[PDB]
Structure 1
Amino acid sequence: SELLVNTKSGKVMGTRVPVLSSHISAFLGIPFAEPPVGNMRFRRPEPKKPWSGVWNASTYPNNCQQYVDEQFPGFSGSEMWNPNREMSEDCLYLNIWVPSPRPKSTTVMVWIYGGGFYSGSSTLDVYNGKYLAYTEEVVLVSLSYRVGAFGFLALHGSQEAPGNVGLLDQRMALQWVHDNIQFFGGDPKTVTIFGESAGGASVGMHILSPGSRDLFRRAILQSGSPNCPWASVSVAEGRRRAVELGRNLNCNLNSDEELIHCLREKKPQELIDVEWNVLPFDSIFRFSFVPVIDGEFFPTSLESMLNSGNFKKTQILLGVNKDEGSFFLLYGAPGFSKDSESKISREDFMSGVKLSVPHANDLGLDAVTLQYTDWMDDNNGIKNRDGLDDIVGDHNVICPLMHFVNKYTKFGNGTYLYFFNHRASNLVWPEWMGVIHGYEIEFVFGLPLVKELNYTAEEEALSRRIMHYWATFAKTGNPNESKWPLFTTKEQKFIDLNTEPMKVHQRLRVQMCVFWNQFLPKLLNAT
């Protein structure tokens, strides 16, 4: 039977799932590690003990314990990102969509969900690999990793809570794909890892971590790069936030051992209830428990690794959305509200930039303000709104990503850069938010093909084109079967991804990224 698969971990029984006018196989909820519960909480993952009998892989698994967005109760714009299955510490599982008839050796695509390292679920509707698997004849794998304190609490030096274990969770699943995907028709030598936002940063981190580079071949990074200001913290900072977390739960802070012991006694929600109280600054687009630059997973600073070529050389496909900052302003900047146009006052703007660049001194804030302010119309509410959107997007996603691609492309084997600037027609988020962070995803996963979701015809076409670009790139290292140009350090070409005839541009937001990548950093160091 096509739904019975034998693996090195045990036999697995999938389920047949309807897709468009056909069907495909799905192996949902395969364990790839031992449940990280009890005294395993905060520990590196353990390979899953082989099992006996058939593992029922017909239904989605639990989602990892995470902060649930309740900012807009019942609103689909935000609930669609929330856990849609019971939450549990026992959440290290993977899901596989396999073409029918089962392929012999086809391209494997491994999806790594984003969500600021504090949230994320592999079971979301927008992450349903069946349309992609089915349409592009790829084996689609979606993994899960521990988020929040559970996956990123870091007490560097201790082995009970070393930090980065959520990154190790990904590694482990990658390890399991490497070792068992051939039994599902997939070629373990043509495994493309792809993710968005924290998923995209995760991808880039796997590219940099020596212990991960051999587990996959190609990488796709969506609105995320490993050097994003929010993707990692120092081990000192990781430690400070861990103590602070303990402080918030009235933990003995006399030793790591006492601290960790206290944190393992706490119920999951207790850690989640106080998770946001350990940020060091009042800010937006900053998450509490993220990857730490520990000297293990990451041998040295990401920047020295990027400068010295210390990373896996391969082909990479990456890009950004036009309005990456909008979502974060909405949830944490004053003056923004879902149901208004969010025209922003100069007073609100100034406080907005302060939240956006939390580490800057006043001079830094002044440099940002000068750079993003139209001084010929500094009271324009639309312009202040939009300028703020760009500030948040440019600094947190686009410029860090642009720095990454420029460092990467010096040593890599092929860089393909996109700019997704298409606003879905059926978007429920206010128009001012633009082409929102995370909204390329439904296009990558082919949601626009299911008519009942009401996308336009042109949007179906764009999805098909993006899916084909992504699958083709995973298969051969080149998106192309007009042409999506190679990104080179000299020409810096990139393409637009929208319902209009693709256009080729150069130097994505140069002016601003020179400001964020070269000038601001120099400013803050000088002062």
Structure 2
Amino acid sequence: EDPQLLVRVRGGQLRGIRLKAPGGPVSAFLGIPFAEPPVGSRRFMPPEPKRPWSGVLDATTFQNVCYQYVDTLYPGFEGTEMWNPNRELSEDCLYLNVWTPYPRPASPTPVLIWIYGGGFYSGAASLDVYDGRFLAQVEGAVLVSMNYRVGTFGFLALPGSREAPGNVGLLDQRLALQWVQENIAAFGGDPMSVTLFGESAGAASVGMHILSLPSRSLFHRAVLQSGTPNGPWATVSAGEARRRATLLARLVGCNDTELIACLRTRPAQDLVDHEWHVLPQESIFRFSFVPVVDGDFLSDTPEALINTGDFQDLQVLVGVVKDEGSYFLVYGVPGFSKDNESLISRAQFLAGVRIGVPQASDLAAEAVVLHYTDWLHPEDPTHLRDAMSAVVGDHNVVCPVAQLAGRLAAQGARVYAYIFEHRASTLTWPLWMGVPHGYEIEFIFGLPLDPSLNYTTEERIFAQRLMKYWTNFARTGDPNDPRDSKSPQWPPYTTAAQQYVSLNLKPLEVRRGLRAQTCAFWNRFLPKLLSAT
């Protein structure tokens, strides 16, 4: 047997598998348990450390996907299926994966931990876009990704209860982080250099680990791609979490202890079947079971915590894609489809705003419409379409990111900001969606280096550039290549200059102001409105 594929961790022995990357071999250790299976009476409960095992544990294949909703909007369409579970569904899903160079690193190597997105209701670390073999082979990185419980199983909460305290899916991540501290050195990883990176909900998670004291000893740097702990969708209050919980109970036929008990007797799919039915308003970019402000994992609201925190020791990399809000429109906004160009009326644009901004009063929705209308072409359907997408993208991602970047920089943190503007040649969504939520990922992970994927040679060169930014940031807290002495360099985001760079096929371009005027509308004015309307 290959002694490179044999690792001893604190729970026993593992056997990895040697995988082929276009530039050489990597060692992969897939399906490693970091927790006791959260099944039976362990549903809704905090995770427990995995018990030791005898013999050699087979770690050559991906484990099961955490039980979750499966998207059926466009059946067979590779643009939606690419996010769908590629393994069997099970509540027994608390496993992680490790990629490493072959042979294992001679010296301690910086670690990247990926936390997947999926709106806290879906996702898996086994998806092709999260394949860590390229980063391990090309940049010699140790890459880790875990599964964490999503939906009811991960975030159903009856705050104050002992049997559904909330945020267990976040605790799953933290336990995987502790596992890395205890075990990564056996793979060649440096536990004193751990960078978290995640997209969407994963970025929000990374953000919440920044804001939770127990997590802060488990990593040193953070990357938040198109997601924030602050904002309208990533958290709920104890009252709203409690509300959605007993409503789901009432829907499936079910005192807290008695309520949770009956819920635990329910088959997994019975809970998923009514998952979307507990949202208080008709909406998009809104999810039923997400992290809750419990006063424990989150001592206060993320907004309150980023306003008051000292981030002097922090180094962050944040950013967005060009068209954050485009594909959420086809999931609830009338007039939008991936099968036409989605040219909409004006009445439809006002209607879509009540759905895109479901918490807005009449006056606040009016303010949004009047801000986003191009008064030179106030009824042009093309413009009305592009603005609906902008309303959604800015409200949910771009401005919460700008808000976070601003507070962090102002309060000591070292912040780097980007906007991802390249659209993949292989994208299957229509052109009107441009660069949609989550399509920077396949480039960070280095997928275009696989010739069977049919990317362009320019995209391949682009992917290699991004892997260097991300890995150099992990090594240093600075995404700038210390070998390249060319200028322009990537400058840190500050509250004064507000500098950020654009990521595309052309060399880095430095820009200033991250949707400054429009985000001032969202971050400074709208709160004053709703808190008076």
Q: Same fold (TM over 0.5)?
A: yes
In the alignment of these two chains, the number of paired residues is 524
Aligned partner of 1:492 in structure 2 is 498
* Corresponding letter in the other structure for 2:520: V
1:117 corresponds, among 99, 120, 142, to 120
CA contact (8 A) 1:207 1:312 kept: no
SS where residue 259 of structure 1 aligns? helix
* Corresponding letter in the other structure for 1:105: P
Q: Would you say 1:299 and 2:305 are equivalent positions?
A: no
* Corresponding letter in the other structure for 1:456: T
SS where residue 151 of structure 1 aligns? helix
CA contact (8 A) 2:318 2:416 kept: yes
CA RMSD of aligned residues (A): 0.9
- Following superposition of structure 1 onto structure 2, how do residues 23-422 of structure 1 map, counting pairs within 5 Å? 23-103=25-105, 104-251=107-254, 255-309=255-309, 313-422=313-422
Aligned partner of 1:463 in structure 2 is 463
* Corresponding letter in the other structure for 1:243: T
Tell me, in whole angstroms, the C-alpha distance in 2 between the residues paired with 1:483 and 1:330. Answer: 38
SS where residue 522 of structure 1 aligns? helix
Tell me by how many angstroms 1:245 deviates. 0.5
SS where residue 147 of structure 2 aligns? coil
* Corresponding letter in the other structure for 1:510: A
Tell me by how many angstroms 1:414 deviates. 1.2
CA contact (8 A) 1:114 1:197 kept: yes
CA contact (8 A) 1:117 1:289 kept: yes
* Corresponding letter in the other structure for 1:522: K
* Corresponding letter in the other structure for 1:229: P
Aligned partner of 2:433 in structure 1 is 433
- Following superposition of structure 1 onto structure 2, how do residues 495-506 of structure 1 map, counting pairs within 5 Å? 495-506=501-512
Tell me by how many angstroms 1:21 deviates. 3.5
Tell me, in whole angstroms, the C-alpha distance in 2 between the residues paired with 1:401 and 1:413. Answer: 14
* Corresponding letter in the other structure for 1:491: A
CA contact (8 A) 2:6 2:16 kept: yes
List alignment gaps of at least 5 residues for structure 1.
none
Tell me by how many angstroms 1:344 deviates. 1.1
CA contact (8 A) 2:249 2:259 kept: yes
Tell me, in whole angstroms, the C-alpha distance in 1 between the residues paired with 2:311 and 2:83. Answer: 32
SS where residue 43 of structure 1 aligns? coil
* Corresponding letter in the other structure for 1:121: A
CA contact (8 A) 1:313 1:411 kept: no
TM-score w.r.t. the length of structure 2 is 0.97
Tell me, in whole angstroms, the C-alpha distance in 2 between the residues paired with 1:310 and 1:9. Answer: 37
Tell me by how many angstroms 1:310 deviates. 5.2
CA contact (8 A) 1:201 1:228 kept: no
Tell me, in whole angstroms, the C-alpha distance in 1 between the residues paired with 2:464 and 2:496. Answer: 31
CA contact (8 A) 1:29 1:93 kept: yes
Tell me, in whole angstroms, the C-alpha distance in 1 between the residues paired with 2:192 and 2:430. Answer: 43
CA contact (8 A) 1:161 1:260 kept: yes
Tell me, in whole angstroms, the C-alpha distance in 2 between the residues paired with 1:500 and 1:332. Answer: 35
Tell me by how many angstroms 1:301 deviates. 2.1
List alignment gaps of at least 5 residues for structure 2.
482-487
Distance of aligned partners of 1:312 and 1:485 in 2 relative to their CA distance in 1, 3 Å threshold: closer
Tell me by how many angstroms 1:311 deviates. 5.7
* Corresponding letter in the other structure for 2:40: G
Q: Deviations over 1:342-376 (max 9, x none)?
A: 00111111111110111111000000000000123
TM-score w.r.t. the length of structure 1 is 0.98
CA contact (8 A) 1:109 1:193 kept: yes
CA contact (8 A) 1:415 1:488 kept: yes
CA contact (8 A) 1:209 1:311 kept: no
Taking only the aligned residue pairs, the percentage that are identical comes to: 60
Tell me, in whole angstroms, the C-alpha distance in 2 between the residues paired with 1:304 and 1:438. Answer: 28
* Corresponding letter in the other structure for 1:43: M
Tell me by how many angstroms 1:228 deviates. 2.3
Tell me by how many angstroms 1:462 deviates. 1.1
Tell me, in whole angstroms, the C-alpha distance in 2 between the residues paired with 1:12 and 1:412. Answer: 42
* Corresponding letter in the other structure for 1:488: T
Tell me, in whole angstroms, the C-alpha distance in 2 between the residues paired with 1:188 and 1:30. Answer: 18
SS where residue 172 of structure 1 aligns? helix
Tell me, in whole angstroms, the C-alpha distance in 2 between the residues paired with 1:230 and 1:312. Answer: 27
